[PDB]
């Protein structure tokens, strides 16, 4: 359906990142799934360019692609890991979880 | 035990108790690398050395730095290199009742090491009348 | 091929925006076309979430979608237009042209 | 499409050596053209969060002094008055910034002025330069 945030759990052993990440074993990162057809609702915080590109695609679908449903705001998580051999802990490891999706 | 139990305890402290957060965003634990030296102990005074492979990026604001050790007065030196030069980093006092781990403020010395090159630094601990390895903790923000 | 900026001219009469936009009659807005397969090059400025989402999709597909090629930095253009009936001129009407693409 | 606003777009699109002092430039028209000498009337409306940088009143003249008042009801309030030159003068601008700034603070959006001279698509218009914060 529409562009919205959907659940998505990432286990660090599945992607091989457990080699340098001590804790946690995983976290809920979510993802943005959906379509961005004109008109774009304002809750998706659509940019001016995303509005026009979606409008040009509505008339001529081969002149321009359609706006994509991507994360627009990311949240950090606490991570204990090994950085170059030193045990490092970041309380806010930025860019890990999705909090807001939107059309861009 | 590859992750020090302190860094593991820090992670569990702030994950379970979300009412508090670290004073800095980035916390590093530098292990001592001199595991073969024996403390010299005259009756009334004990001294032993330490080593640390410290490397903090220059674009970080170092907030605090604690040296974790263990009526006694402790003095922590830094040997800069007879021509040896011993600089007092902190002259603190402790209590004698089940103190277990005692912390010492060596933040000034760490900011000095950040402004200079990432090198190995050698310390000495003076106290007067494996898993317990002293480790140096460095708090810093990503400015 | 890779995620990159492709040309795209937008005529305001084609999309019906010539009713309120006085000048220009159009402009080059560009667009971002391409794919974001792991690994994501650093010139695409991939977020940590875009890196992991592309990595989990590389190993286990159908668990997560692929990172999308969207504009990451937009530029303004000078626009003379009618805002609620008053002749308005903005030297920087923000968000109109694409300057940098990337994976998100 | 006033010639001034069109000429402002073409000025800053070709001469990239300079840019406007403000981001937003609005030009309000005079709606009292059914008169002969003369009064003016403007339907000004500007958001309150915008900082009015400057306001210019553009008049068309065919060395004397010109005074501009704000009608209130006759408790006429002088806004600006200068001695213009008559050497084939065409368009003359006068700063009415402060008059617009208190007009920006609520009040009736409709305003009426009057120009006095001392002993046609040229309809005068009022231009407001404002920044958006
Ligand atoms: C420890 O210091 C040495 C130089 O004395 C350096 O080569 C090495 O990279 C450091 N340790 C680590 C884990 O990087
Ligand atoms: C002129 O001002 C009135 C308020 O007195 C307003 O209702 C009207 O919409 C304005 N004119 C235009 C063209 O917007």
Author numbering:
A (entry chain A), C (entry chain B): 321 to 424
B (entry chain C): 79 to 148, 162 to 172, 179 to 226, 247 to 260
D (entry chain D): 81 to 117, 126 to 150, 162 to 172, 181 to 226, 247 to 260
What does the paper say about this structure?
The TGF-β ligands are dimers and initiate signal transduction by forming a signalling complex with two copies of a type I receptor and two copies of a type II receptor; all are single-pass transmembrane proteins containing a small extracellular ligand-binding domain (ECD) and an intracellular kinase domain (ICD). Upon signalling complex formation, the constitutively active type II receptor phosphorylates and activates the type I receptor; subsequently the type I receptor phosphorylates Smad1/5 or Smad2/3 to regulate transcriptional responses. For example, ActRIIA/B bind to and mediate the signalling from both activin ligands and some BMP ligands, whereas BMPRII is the low-affinity type II receptor for over 15 BMP ligands. Of note, BMPRII is particularly highly expressed in lung vascular endothelial cells, where it mediates the signalling from circulating BMP9 and BMP10.
Here we also solved the crystal structures of BMP10 in a non-covalent complex with its prodomain (Pro:BMP10), which provided a BMP10 conformation in yet another protein interaction context. Two crystal forms were solved to 2.9 Å (crystal form 1, which contains Pro:BMP10 with mutations in the prodomain unstructured regions to promote crystal contacts), and to 3.5 Å (crystal form 2, which contains wild type (WT) Pro:BMP10), respectively. The two structures overlay well in the BMP10 chains and in the prodomain regions that interact with BMP10. The prodomain regions that are not engaged in protein-protein interactions and the α5 helix are truncated or disordered, i.e., not visible in the crystal structures. Importantly, the interface between the prodomain and BMP10 is identical in both structures and comprised of interactions from the extended β-sheet and the α2 helix, conserved with previously reported Pro:BMP9 structures. The four BMP10 monomers in the two Pro:BMP10 structures provided the conformation of BMP10 in the prodomain-bound form for further analysis. In the presence of the prodomain, the fingertip 3/4 is found in the bent conformation for both BMP9 and BMP10. Prodomain-binding fixes BMP9 and BMP10 in the bent conformation, presumably a more restrained conformation at least for BMP9 because the three free BMP9 structures, reported by different groups and using proteins purified by different methods, are all in the extended conformation.
